Structure formats: structure tokens, C-alpha cells
Amino acid sequence: GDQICIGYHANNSTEQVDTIMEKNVTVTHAQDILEKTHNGKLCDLNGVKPLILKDCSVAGWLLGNPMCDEFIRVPEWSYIVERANPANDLCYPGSLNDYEELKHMLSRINHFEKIQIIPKSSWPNHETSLGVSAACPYQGAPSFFRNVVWLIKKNDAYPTIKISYNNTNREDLLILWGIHHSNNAEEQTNLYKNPITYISVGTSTLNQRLAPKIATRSQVNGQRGRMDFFWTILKPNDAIHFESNGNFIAPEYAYKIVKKGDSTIMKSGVEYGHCNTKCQTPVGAINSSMPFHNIHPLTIGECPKYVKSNKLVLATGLRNSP
């Protein structure tokens, strides 16, 4: 007689899925929920370009390392890009205090503006032009950090400094200063004329006293001397008071800074690509809605959950037989 049959779909498809009880099952249609693709470029994060320090560290950028490129106005950024080992960090050897907290705080900045707070004219009793070193060469000539001044004795005398700066701006100020550790007693007098010296820094919260550590040290960038740099945030209508009789690396520029959100520092050599994204990795940005990915763990932004997987394939069609 007449015949009627019941059957399901099949197609030319070698797509594979796995189940809890059966391995290596071929299906008609399947979907992968594991993101594995990126654009290979560093992109803007939610419409804000990153601050790309080419080969400079944050400390060299902030202090004005002469080998680092001249300050270009980047009034805002969403994250900072450094190379794995920045070459130009501190041309004169030493340290920057609380460096990692400072780097974390500068990772995402809403407004960043460099201003002059103490011009080199404001040191009439001290030499302001001999503060140079072969460890900080510019155009082959000995130089120094741009944004600070290395004061030296004038007329074989170093009168005690007593200067203040009141923050009249509407925004917080990032201020950096330093102390120079000389190599021996003779070098201490040759530069500052005062054998025993100090530095005092005062604000509404900061109460700092520093003394030079005159000792024998190993040569770094050809110099046995050291400079220790320090920073503070001067809130509006507060003032910072400096006082020293030697070894003082005075600020000249400061930075008006407004901070709204948080980020981190990304280590990458990948180039900027004039794109936009909501999830960024050191190897490229991610444009996806998947819940999982396996590209890189050091992501910044709203990103899929990082897993150790090559594929997470979900069966949508029927079991396809050849």
C-alpha cells in the first residue's frame, strides 16, 4: 500500500562536538562559545586613547629624561603602555619613591596638564645652570632632567632656601622633588659648600626630612652618585614648603591632575591602530560577546572570562551521519 516515514535532517558537515557520555560526535550545526581572535592592535578603550610611552618609563616621562621625547600634551588617557624593559627611565641613577603606587594612580587620568610653578628665575642666590651630568646626555652634551633643577652653590656659598608654593589652581597638583647623594666629603663641599645638609618638605599632610647619604657606591651610567626623588599630591588651596641648605633637586614644573577611574599599566610592543574597543590585551583588542576566551590573561576592560581551552563547541543541530 501507501507508505509514510518519519526522519530528521542531515547535511555535508564534519563539525564535531563532545558530550559527557560520548566523545567525537559529528553534528549538523554547532556553535563555539570560545573567543580566540583579536585584531593585533592597541585600540582606544571606550573612546579614550592610551598613553603610549615609546621607550620611556613613567619616571623618565614625569621627570623629563632628556633622551625621552619632549612632552606632548596628552590631556587624558585610559591606560599606559610601556615596553617590557623601558630603556630611558632614570638617566641619573637613583630611585623614585612609591613608584608603583604612583604608576597605578597615573594609569587612567581624566585631565593632565603640565604647568610651571617655580621658574628658574626664582633662585637668585643659587646656581641653576651647572646642574648637568654626562649620565643625562642631550645632543651628546651633558644635561639633566627637564622638569627639575639641580641647584649648585654660587660664589662658594649655598644660602638656606625657604620657598613656598600655594596651589591656586582648581585641580590637584603632582609635584616631584629630589635629593642628591654625593660621593665623598670633598665632592659635597665642591657642589654645596655645606658639609652637613638637610631637606625639609611640608604640606598639610607631608612632614619630610631628608639627609644625604655620602658613601661609596658602584657606577651606574658612569656615576657613583645617586638621586632619590619623591612625590606628593598638593590639594587645592594647600601649600608646599621647601627648605634646604644643600643637595636639593628643586621642582620647576608640576602636573595638574584629575582622576576619575582606575586602570593598570600594560606591557606591550604592539602598535597603535586608531581603533576602539571595550576589551584590550597586550596582543590585540577583542570585539566579542562570548563568555570565554583564551587569548591573554593580562586584559584591561570588560572582557570574557579567561580559560584554558582550545574549543568550547555547543551542539545546535542534529547528529549527522554520512
Partner: protein, 174 residues
Amino acid sequence: GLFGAIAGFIEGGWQGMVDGWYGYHHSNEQGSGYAADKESTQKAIDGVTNKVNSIIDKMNTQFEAVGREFNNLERRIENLNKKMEDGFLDVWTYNAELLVLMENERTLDFHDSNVKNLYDKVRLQLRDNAKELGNGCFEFYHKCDNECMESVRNGTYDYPQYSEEARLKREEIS
């Protein structure tokens, strides 16, 4: 599967079926062809589409910035962050892998159930008016039009009409 329809009585899978997931194949004196149960496939299509979107959309994502911000004298804290990142990766990997395995099993038995639910939909209309072959096919005890063929797919089959006709070949043909 569990319901015994993909690897049970039906040992096929029709490549010529290209406008649906589940369907029918008819054989009468007017010809042959493939018909799609649009109702049955639509429930299945929305079911797996909703399952895919639920796994995607229930995932809560927040802004995070993951870096390496501790120096060489903060290794203990750095190790604490390492244990945290490894712990979440192990949690997410294990749950994501097992989610795929468990729900793939449900999907492959969802289609298995749908085929069976369609085989019984045809059977309960035909009853003893037709005969089962044992391979997911029915042999009628009467002539079937292209309208009666469309009636079995529709669900509007008329048992009494061909019931008295069916007896002319049930007990007569011995």
C-alpha cells in the same frame, strides 16, 4: 539517545531534506517527496537558540584591569595574585568545559525526543488503520491522497473514513 529515535528504529537521516530539521517522507501513487514539520522544527530551533543565548547572556562581566604592579620585594603579594588568577581560571575552565558536555548531551536527546514525539503523533492518528514496519515507517491499509498525506502532517486525520476500508485488507489478506 535516551528516547531511541536517532539511533533506534530510524536508522537513517535524509540528506534530501533541506528545508527543515524534522519532517516526513511520503510514498503514494501520486509520487514521492519530502515535507517539513514546520511546527516541530520551530520549537526545536527556538529551544537551542534560547539555550545558546542563555549561556552567553547570563555571564556577568565587569571592568577589570589586570597587570603586574608589584616589585621584586613584594613577591608574596605577587604570589597571592598568581594564586587568585590561577584559581579563577581553574574554576572557569572546569565549569565551562563541563557545562558544554552536560548541555550537549541534553541537546542531542532533545532532538531524539522531538523525532519520537513526531513518530507517535503520526501513529496515534493511524492506529490499526495502518501498519508499522519497524524502521520508522508506516504501511497504510488504504489509499492515501496528497490531501490525506497533508492531513497526517497537519494532525487532522480522519480515522472513521478509511477504518471500514482498512478491514478489507486486514483480515481479508491472510
